[PDB]
Amino acid sequence: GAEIYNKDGNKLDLYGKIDGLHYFSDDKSVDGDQTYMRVGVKGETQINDQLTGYGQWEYNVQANNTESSSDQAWTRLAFAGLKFGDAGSFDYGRNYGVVYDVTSWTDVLPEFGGDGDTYGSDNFLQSRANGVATYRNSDFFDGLNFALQYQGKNGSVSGEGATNNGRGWSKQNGDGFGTSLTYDIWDGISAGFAYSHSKRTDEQNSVPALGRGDNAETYTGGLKYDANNIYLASQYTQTYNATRAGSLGFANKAQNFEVVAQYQFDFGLRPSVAYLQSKGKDLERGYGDQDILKYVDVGATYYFNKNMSTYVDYKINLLDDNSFTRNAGISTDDVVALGLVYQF
Amino acid sequence: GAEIYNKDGNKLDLYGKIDGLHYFSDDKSVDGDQTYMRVGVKGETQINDQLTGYGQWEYNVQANNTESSSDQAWTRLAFAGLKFGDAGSFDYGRNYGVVYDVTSWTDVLPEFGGDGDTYGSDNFLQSRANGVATYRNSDFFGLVDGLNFALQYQGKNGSVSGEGATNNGRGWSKQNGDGFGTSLTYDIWDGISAGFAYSHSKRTDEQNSVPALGRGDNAETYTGGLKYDANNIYLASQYTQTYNATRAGSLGFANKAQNFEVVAQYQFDFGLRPSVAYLQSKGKDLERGYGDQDILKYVDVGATYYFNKNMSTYVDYKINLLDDNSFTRNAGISTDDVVALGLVYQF
Amino acid sequence: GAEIYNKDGNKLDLYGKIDGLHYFSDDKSVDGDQTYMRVGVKGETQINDQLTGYGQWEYNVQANNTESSSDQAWTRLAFAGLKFGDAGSFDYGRNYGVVYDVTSWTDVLPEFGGDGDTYGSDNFLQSRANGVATYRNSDFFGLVDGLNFALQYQGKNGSVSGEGATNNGRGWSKQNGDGFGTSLTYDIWDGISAGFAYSHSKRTDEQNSVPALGRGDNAETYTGGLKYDANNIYLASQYTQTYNATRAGSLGFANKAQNFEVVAQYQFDFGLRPSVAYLQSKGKDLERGYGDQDILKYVDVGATYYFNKNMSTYVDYKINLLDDNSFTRNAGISTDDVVALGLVYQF
């Protein structure tokens, strides 16, 4: 983040990165150039002694396709808020669902991991989401962070279930809420829990073959060790009608586990190993139990300084190629990524 | 505000906002999350004692849809110009048609009003438009304080292909032929103002052949308006008569229309700013049996609370007065009420 | 320019322009408003005494169409890199192919010329390209002053689907296989420069099956250029011979092509810069009975007035010498003349 303005109680921070990134894989929908950049602004205005206003915007711009390609930029974050001293905060807009307050702890791989793996974006309150109202509280009115979050319906393009901002069933949601709780038990050791409950939409219960139910729910617990140049974290999440069974629908229930170990050398190298799986249960069309995601991750980042880094990441895919993985379009091939990153 | 660069006669102002916004309505095409942000840059360069060069860009970025959605960002303004002291200024690009130099006086509602209501964008010289050349003069060459005028030309913006095409083609509703416009505002006191604007554009072939409604070779607008803005009080009205220029929803254009807007506001010292307004658009001589039809009719009541110059919150309540009829249904015109709630950070 | 951040060994430069631009032409796909803007960031971080890290992004935003139009913005450049003192530099991203290290010498017309004429973007290593790794060496390891060379590799950018696919698939016209290129330039005197460039890329199976024109496993370019730049005079020429690498409009590629560009300019002290140029592209051995064909042929006359480093105005007149024939019609190649007028704010 680069502070480009700070005057009369108003500050403006410009941030972002250019990620020169290549993927190597037998999966042709993944293989090739993946260069992209992100640009954002964080703004803060002092209102009074007990009140600060703020806003943030984060934009993703792909740079790996041609100058006539379409749909190459999208907003990741866009929200405005009030901070009432230390007595917490409120914001509304496109922001992270509170489930990520805990699952973010395993989202630290050099390249892979995070949204797209055990959960996705626009996926109820599991990641970035449209129309979230988020109340947060530090030190529970000590060191104990609480959030409560509401999300209005984001429905179909047209018909009964429509809203202004309609989309496909995979990215729809009804009215929902979430809550998170995180705590530093020792110095360095944190624990966290999160819960979300959302109504599903009529299209989610009629267009895809997989996943039926009135409500989507997530229960998450997570642990993190972050001291002494060591980073360990795990996340265990159980879901009902909330995890995507590739292109085929949702899984009636799923169990997602993510664990990672890393070490940070003084001279800037940071090796990383991780394991991720997603186990879907009670799937329609005779699928039954099925692996949705399963891989070991190894790689490393070298940090030249706080503004420049290079990395390699290797996804060792353990999924077996079967009828479910083919029909749902889930990749079973390995991937290697190489990148060079400038950040500001 | 936000001057991020001011060095050797060149300055750069980065401005914009992040508007956390939700609509509540029985209209499903309007209801729900409406979060969006604006970002722009105002730049100015001193060339010599008598000559300043400038440009401005303004972009709108929706944040209310997904990361795989289409067409979520667009340019509102992009223009470059020269200012020659009190001999006037000239700019070319995407800019406001001069009609808006008067109708902007009523575009002060907490959330509603403005483009989308009695006029829209890419709607001849009524709002933001492609390819306008605009000459402006303030205080009549420095000789008459408070007297401003504008002269404006717009090149044809035509079909996607065929005979009527230009490089930058669009659908008939946002097309225009060659056109011009003029405006004139006068500050009688330092709070009271009167203003007039006129425009005349050629219509294109698609505007006369594709939609069912509206026939004619020319689009004309006549606008008069009044404004009181002082002593914490804001009263403004605008009356506009149009010919082949006002959209009849998706069905075409109204052969003639009468648009009226009026608004009253008060700014309390602690930062609350209530607002009441009334807006209507009456269409006349519509084809296919429609005859005279209301295109828009509503009362608006709301309020903005300014925390400071960088942060506000607002409610706005559109009490819709249209009857649900054959015209409104076939033209895609909303007849439902709307409530808006917003929280806005601005820089 | 516009250094908006410089602190603790890290620098950020915000650059761009707002170009208010109109084209006049009988060619209706070219005629009309062409206003656009560019915005960019050049970033630099000192890592140690011998090593600098850097990144650059450049975005093109059209402003000549409506707020509901599609595909109005795109990335021209996006790359990250390391500079190793005088051992050289390495960057990867969307960047210029090295052939343009020489052909850029003739890309100096007031408005026309450059990509879109004798070569295009996403056209192997002739202009801006996805996925280029580029090594550059200055002054031949600090030894021979004015001698620069570059070595470049590009990975496959393939079809949207099927056997030839990559993640970032596109049309046959903008596809490439694995490829490499090299450039060499030398300032023989001050003001005078010579340069060579070569490139070799595999072609894709879609390029050899979908369009009717152009067959071969490999695309190749050979380029030589000269430049005089001194005493307020600018002269430059570029000659390029290509194999399976030059677009024959929409119909495919030319099995062989010969491209030639030459330009002459003078800079007057009061800011006027007149320009005259000639560009041709001659295609050989085209299938379907086309044979030898002119792909491009025009004389260019124009001028730019620089008010200062931040503002300019210009006119350019393309005098088109192509004869209208069945090749030009079917390939979509314009044979009409065009005048451009522009007013530009730059930061």
Author numbering:
A (entry chain A): 0 to 140, 144 to 346
B (entry chain C), C (entry chain B): 0 to 346
Published text:
Data from OmpK36, which crystallizes in the monoclinic space group C2, were collected at a wavelength of λ = 3.54 Å. In total 12 sulfur atoms are found, from two methionine residues and two sulfates in the trimeric structure. For OmpK36, the analytical absorption correction (AC) gives equivalent merging R factors to spherical harmonics correction (SH), with an overall R merge of 0.119 for both. Notably, the AC strategy leads to an increase in the mean I/σ(I), from 16.42 (SH) to 21.37 (AC), and a stronger anomalous signal, as measured by the anomalous slope (1.69 with AC, as opposed to 1.31 with SH). AC generally gives better results than SH, with the exception of the heights of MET310 in chain B and SO4-1 in chain C, which are larger in the SH data. A clear trend is visible: the analytical absorption correction (AC) is better than the spherical harmonics correction (SH) and the combination of the two (ACSH) improves the data even further. In contrast to the spherical harmonics, the analytical absorption correction is not dependent on multiple observations, and hence is ideally suited for crystals in low-symmetry space groups or for radiation-sensitive crystals at long wavelengths.
